[PDB]
Structure 1
Amino acid sequence: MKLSKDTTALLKNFATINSGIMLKSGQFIMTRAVNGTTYAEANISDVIDFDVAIYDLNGFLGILSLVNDDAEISQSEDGNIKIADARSTIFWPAADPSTVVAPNKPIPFPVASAVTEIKAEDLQQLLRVSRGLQIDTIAITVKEGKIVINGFNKVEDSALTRVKYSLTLGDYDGENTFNFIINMANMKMQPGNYKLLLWAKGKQGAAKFEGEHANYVVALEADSTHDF
């Protein structure tokens, strides 16, 4: 197995979801968050030829940058990892799987309870503004027939009443009133275009972001109100 520019892009992102990762032989990888709040699957252009656990996924992605593209990872002389440069060789510790948090099954999302979309441009504006305004919570709902995103500081807001930010996205052709709430530190996904699929059955509900590179699924918070 060798790794491309496009492959380590993802993984560098997955390290923000969970420090380490457990990847298995195939064209597909997922880290899930430890607290279980958020989860990411994706399919890539490279093939994994063996199972291994990596406890410091960031650390490892760093040493990778310093080797040629042609570089060859493979199980090293003992249970551990080896990256073979044309001229040199580098060893990385292979994690005991007790130590890394694995998702345990490729969660096969339901049928969308509502679909909308969010642009590379809009997601960009959100993430950043979130910083300046100390906006730790957002709730997606319908405002004058369009799907709007709202956001607040759940610390000094607590009721999610005073609205620090509003984003218009697209309009809503269905007839049902819903208010869906996400914890912001649960929004970790690489920049760019995502098809947003909201789904809710009663007290369980979720949000899947369908990107042109990976897919992301975030937990909805307890406060979400709706009819579905």
Structure 2
Amino acid sequence: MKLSKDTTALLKNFATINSGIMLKSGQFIMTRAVNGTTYAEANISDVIDFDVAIYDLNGFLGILSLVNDDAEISQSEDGNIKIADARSTIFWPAADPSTVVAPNKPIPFPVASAVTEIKAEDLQQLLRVSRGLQIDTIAITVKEGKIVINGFNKVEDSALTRVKYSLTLGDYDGENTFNFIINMANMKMQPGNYKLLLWAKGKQGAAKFEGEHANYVVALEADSTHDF
């Protein structure tokens, strides 16, 4: 198998969600944070031709940048990974799968309670601002008939009453009410545009970021409220 630049760029991102990964034969990759707050999946143009668990994904990816593009990666004789360059060979350890937390088989996302979208420059601003504003939690709600994302510094407003940052995502044509709360540390989507699919039922809730390359599903905090 071979890994194009796009595929390694995706893997580098999944590497920020979970340092390790479980690759399975086919053109689909997926991962989740050790604590299950964030999950991500993607169909890739490259094809994986064997099942292997890589404990240090970013390390593996770095080692692939030292080889040619047409490098041929395969399963080493002893069970590891073999990267064959024009005149050189690199062997990378394959880990026992028990040392890598991986997600269960993919299940279709439910039908959305609410739908909207976020543009690359806005996701970028949201993420960049959280650092300087000490924003560690955001809430997607409705104000004056438009979906908006408010940012708070929970450590010192617990009730999320003092909005420090506010972003308008467009108009809401629904009729329901909600204030879905997300933990900023879970927003690991790679930069780019995203369709935002909000889902809630009772005390269950999740936000899906459907992008052009991958999909990210993040959990809503217990404190979330709605009338769906």
CA distance in 2, matches of 1:114, 1:176: 9
Residue by residue over 1:173-207, the C-alpha shift from the partner in whole angstroms, topping out at 9 and shown as x without a partner, is: 01011000001100001101000000010100100
Q: TM-score, normalised by structure 2?
A: 0.99
Counterparts of 1:10 and 1:45, CA distance in 2: 11
**In structure 1, distance between residues paired with 2:73 and 2:95:** 15
Partner deviation per Cα, 1:87-115 (whole Å, 9 max, x = no partner): 11000001100100110121310011100
Q: 5+ unaligned residues in a row in structure 1: which ranges?
A: none
Q: Give the match's secondary structure for 2:94.
A: coil
TM-score (norm 1): 0.99
- Aligned-partner Cα distance in 1 for 2:107–2:20: 19
Q: State the secondary structure of the residue aligned to 2:140.
A: strand
Q: Give the deviation of 1:218 after TM superposition.
A: 0.2
For residues 198 and 87 of structure 1, the distance between their equivalents in structure 2, rounded to whole angstroms, comes to 51
SS at match of 1:208: strand
Distance in 1, Cα, partners of 2:97 & 2:176: 45
Report the CA distance between 1:77 and its aligned residue: 1.3
What's 2:170 paired with? 170
Q: Deviations over 1:54-93 (max 9, x none)?
A: 0000111100111111001111010111000011100000
Aligned counterparts of 1:69 and 1:202: Cα–Cα separation in 2: 49
Query: What CA distance in whole angstroms lies between the structure 2 residues aligned with 1:124 and 1:184?
Result: 13
SS at match of 1:69: coil
SS at structure 1 position matched to 2:156: coil
Counterparts of 1:160 and 1:107, CA distance in 2: 33
> 1:50 Cα shift?
0.3
Alignment of 1:43-192 (within 5 A): 43-192=43-192
Tell me how far apart the structure 2 counterparts of residues 84 and 34 of structure 1 sit (CA, whole Å): 32
Q: Secondary structure at the match of 1:141?
A: strand
Describe the SS at the equivalent of 1:89: strand
Count how many residue pairs are aligned between Structure 1 and Structure 2.
Answer: 228
